[PDB]
Amino acid sequence: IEDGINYDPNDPTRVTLSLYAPGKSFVYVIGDFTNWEVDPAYFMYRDAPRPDSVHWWITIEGLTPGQEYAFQYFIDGELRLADLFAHKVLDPWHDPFIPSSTYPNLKPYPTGKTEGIVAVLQPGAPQYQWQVTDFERPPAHELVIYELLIRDFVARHDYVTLIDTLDYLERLGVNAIELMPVAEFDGNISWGYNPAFHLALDKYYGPADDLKRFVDECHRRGIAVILDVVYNHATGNSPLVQLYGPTADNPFINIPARHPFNVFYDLNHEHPYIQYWLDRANRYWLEEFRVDGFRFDLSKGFTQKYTDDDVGAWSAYDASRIRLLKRMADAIWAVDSTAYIILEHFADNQEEKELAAYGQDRGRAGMLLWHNLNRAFSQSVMGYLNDPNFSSDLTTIYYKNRGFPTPNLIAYMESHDEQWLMYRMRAYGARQGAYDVRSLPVALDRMKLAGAFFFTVPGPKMIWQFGELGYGYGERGEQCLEGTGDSCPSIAPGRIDPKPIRWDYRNDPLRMKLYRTWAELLRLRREHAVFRSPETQVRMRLQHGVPGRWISLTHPELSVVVVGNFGLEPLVVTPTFPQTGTWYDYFNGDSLVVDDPNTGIELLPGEFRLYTNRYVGQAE
Numbered sequence: 001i002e003d004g005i006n007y008d009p010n011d012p013t014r015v016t017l018s019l020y021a022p023g024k025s026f027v028y029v030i031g032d033f034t035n036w037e038v039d040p041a042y043f044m045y046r047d048a049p050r051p052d053s054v055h056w057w058i059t060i061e062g063l064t065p066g067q068e069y070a071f072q073y074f075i076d077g078e079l080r081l082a083d084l085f086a087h088k089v090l091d092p093w094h095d096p097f098i099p100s101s102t103y104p105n106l107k108p109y110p111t112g113k114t115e116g117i118v119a120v121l122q123p124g125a126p127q128y129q130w131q132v133t134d135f136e137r138p139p140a141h142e143l144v145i146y147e148l149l150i151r152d153f154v155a156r157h158d159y160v161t162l163i164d165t166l167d168y169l170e171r172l173g174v175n176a177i178e179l180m181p182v183a184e185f186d187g188n189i190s191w192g193y194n195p196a197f198h199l200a201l202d203k204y205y206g207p208a209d210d211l212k213r214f215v216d217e218c219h220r221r222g223i224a225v226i227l228d229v230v231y232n233h234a235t236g237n238s239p240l241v242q243l244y245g246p247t248a249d250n251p252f253i254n255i256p257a258r259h260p261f262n263v264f265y266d267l268n269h270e271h272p273y274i275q276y277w278l279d280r281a282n283r284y285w286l287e288e289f290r291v292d293g294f295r296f297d298l299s300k301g302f303t304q305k306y307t308d309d310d311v312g313a314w315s316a317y318d319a320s321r322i323r324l325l326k327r328m329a330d331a332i333w334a335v336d337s338t339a340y341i342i343l344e345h346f347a348d349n350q351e352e353k354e355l356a357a358y359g360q361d362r363g364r365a366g367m368l369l370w371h372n373l374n375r376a377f378s379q380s381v382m383g384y385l386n387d388p389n390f391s392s393d394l395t396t397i398y399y400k401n402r403g404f405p406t407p408n409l410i411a412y413m414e415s416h417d418e419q420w421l422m423y424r425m426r427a428y429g430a431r432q433g434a435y436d437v438r439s440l441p442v443a444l445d446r447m448k449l450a451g452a453f454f455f456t457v458p459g460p461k462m463i464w465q466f467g468e469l470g471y472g473y474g475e476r477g478e479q480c481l482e483g484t485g486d487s488c489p490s491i492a493p494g495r496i497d498p499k500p501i502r503w504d505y506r507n508d509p510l511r512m513k514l515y516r517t518w519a520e521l522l523r524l525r526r527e528h529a530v531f532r533s534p535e536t537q538v539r540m541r542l543q544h545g546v547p548g549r550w551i552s553l554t555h556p557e558l559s560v561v562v563v564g565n566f567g568l569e570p571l572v573v574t575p576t577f578p579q580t581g582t583w584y585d586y587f588n589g590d591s592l593v594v595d596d597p598n599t600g601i602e603l604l605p606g607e608f609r610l611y612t613n614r615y616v617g618q619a620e
């Protein structure tokens with residue numbers, strides 16, 4: 001027996017419920033099976049082996065197999081609380097607005113019988129029949145991740161509709177999908193960073209068995225699924241907050257928050273019960289939905305070290321935080337030794353290096369860290385390479401140039417938290433003569449160039465939905481993210497508000513050429529280890545201000561030179577080819593003789609070329 005809802009694998013008519021609640025006087029279970037009344041047979045037993053480990057529990061008999069029952073703990077005759085470990089809840093304020101098409105036959109809230117969110121249990125639950133048994137998850141350091149917000153990815157915002165997009169995603173050449181938070185969040189309309197029930201599946205995206213079908217279908221196609229998960233904080237609807245109230249008296253929470261950038265109620269990760277709950281949550285998502293790992297939102301917030309509103313102090317090396325993250329990782333890897341642990345961290349290099357290295361000497365992949373190159377890519381594609389404020393240097397895309405010994409950095413040009421590159425190009429892009437980065441077709445070409453200087457570099461990578469079709473700006477600037485230091489037009493939505501959904505972009509041949517370029521780069525990457533391996537040696541000319549940029553890669557199987565003109569006029573770019581001989585132009589289907597490692601390539605602005613030292617086919 002654990003806290004939460006315990007089923008009997010041999011008897012689908014019964015459950016045992018357990019609640020951690022030191023300091024309480026008495027507890028009842030109320031619910032469908034008590035007609036929401038107080039019934040003595042539902043007064044809970046107190047198990048208190050030591051005063052700091054008080055659990056209330058009861059075994060409930062005589063339930064109907066397959067039936068859903070709503071319930072709450074009724075604590076000290078006042079507090080009605082849904083189970084912290086509920087996997088499904090009914091929300092009286094927001095469930096009325098979930099369409100029947102989104103969640104068929106959704107059990108209605110028991111209006112007037114109780115108040116507040118209720119938990120749902122279901123003895124004899126039908127078990128999804130998993131089809132894929134032999135799934136091999138991509139090596140952590142080879143991840144090419146597609147960040148997806150279900151709300152804005154498809155108009156129907158649900159798992160069953162996601163399944164219809166898988167051909168589109170598979171063909172792009174990504175090997176993992178990262179879903180923005182799926183765990184029960186306040187309301188229906190959210191990015192998902194307002195979690196209420198961290199082990200429940202938000203019903204606005206559809207039923208659990210449809211998510212299972214999605215994970216299984218991804219697995220069938222060799223694609224991993226990562227869940228973005230939000231454990232720094234909990235909303236006031238979380239039982240962590242409600243059980244002892246939203247004050248400093250509540251030992252689970254920090255009032256005030258311990259660090260900058262907190263939202264809702266900052267959790268105390270040093271609390272043993274919070275550690276237990278966190279471990280339970282990670283274990284649940286792995287076991288129940290067979291996901292391949294997690295992206296931990298606001299992982300720098302996993303600390304009791306007090307840094308107030310001082311970002312520099314917060315970001316500095318924090319031994320306690322490192323202990324906590326390692327302890328969490330140990331538990332995850334005891335469930336599944338190759339699950340991905342991805343941190344949205346942004347700490348100082350000493351800390352990030354230590355978390356990256358962790359476990360690599362004793363059976364683990366290390367943690368993966370978000371590596372934000374949105375600004376530098378923004379400057380590069382806009383054509384402001386010697387900007388007075390913002391670096392256009394792309395050198396650190398390669399992990400060793402950031403002083404990391406192993407490919408544990410997930411680089412991205414774009415994320416849900418950052419401006420769209422196409423917004424910045426179309427709103428602000430540079431121009432010279434008749435060459436205008438603000439023109440859509442010109443801007444799309446610059447995203448091909450960006451991709452050639454991104455997907456080709458060893459180490460994991462992430463892209464944000466629809467960048468591959470040139471999402472951003474839109475018709476008149478409405479595709480603009482607020483809060484990124486750009487003054488969006490008035491027509492743009494608020495930062496976390498629903499964004500335009502534009503699947504019609506597939507009908508634009510210019511936008512599909514960008515998609516196909518990225519897809520062809522990722523098709524190459526899939527079968528050529530040069531683009532993926534820690535063994536690859538990388539040299540580059542990606543410095544701030546320099547329009548004629550290049551990357552060389554050398555590996556036992558292949559050598560590659562990528563050339564690009566990030567300027568606004570024609571230029572001869574002179575890479576250092578690693579060897580003389582014939583080099584083959586992948587996209588254009590011809591070849592160049594390199595009689596000196598320093599050979600010039602004339603390029604129009606925005607153009608790139610990818611050369612290999614052996615013929616390996618032609619882009620199709």
Ligand SMILES: [Ca+2]
Binds near residue numbers: 091185186188204
């Ligand atoms: Ca919700």
Ligand SMILES: [Mn+2]
Binds near residue numbers: 232233258262302
């Ligand atoms: Mn925190």
